[PDB]
Every structure is written in structure tokens, then in C-alpha cells.
Amino acid sequence: DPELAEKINEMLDVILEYKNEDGELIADVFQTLPTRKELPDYYQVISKPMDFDRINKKIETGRYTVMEELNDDMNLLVNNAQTYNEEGSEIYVSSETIGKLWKEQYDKFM
């Protein structure tokens, strides 16, 4: 649905453009997971992988019909990072910031 897609793209651009105090695009490490060949141990821990590459492919193929489906995928992205990575690590901290940014976008979409 083009209207939903455009809303999604506007909300995700907020997250994808955000920089931390150090000038780093916090979302960059969540774009593309290491592959199953590169990092098999990730997949033994994480049963449902999610990244922004997968989210984009779903936008392009009509797999989002309602905003709650994207909310599920963003919660998956965040929760996987916090399952896999140690608390206080840069990647964990970045995931926490993504979670907060997403909830602001989702809460304002309503």
C-alpha cells in the first residue's frame, strides 16, 4: 500500500539517519547481519534473525499490511541485539537507542 510504505519509509529514515555523540550512524551495524557462513554461532543463539536489509525486502514485496507487523520486526531487531551482545557494549547501547527512537515513531504514527 503506497501510503503505508511512505509512512514506514519516513519513520525508518529517522532511525537510519541518527548519529550518536561520537558521530557514528548507530543503525549501520544493524543493516546487514553477518552471514550464516561468516558467523554460524549467531544463528545458534538467535532463532529469528532480523536486519534492515530484510525489512526493506519486506517493504518492496508488500509484506507489511499494517504498522504492527513492522513494530514486530523492529522489536525483533532490538531484542536480538540485546540477546546476542553484552549489556553495556556499543552495539547493545545502540540497540537501546534504536528501540527508543522506534517507540517515538510508532507512538506518533497513532
Binding site: P34, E86, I91, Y92
Partner: peptide, 5 residues
């Protein structure tokens, strides 16, 4: 930049 447990 992963930090596995």
C-alpha cells in the same frame, strides 16, 4: 562491532 556473550 559485535560483543558476544
Amino acid at each position: 562491532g559485535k560483543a558476544p556473550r
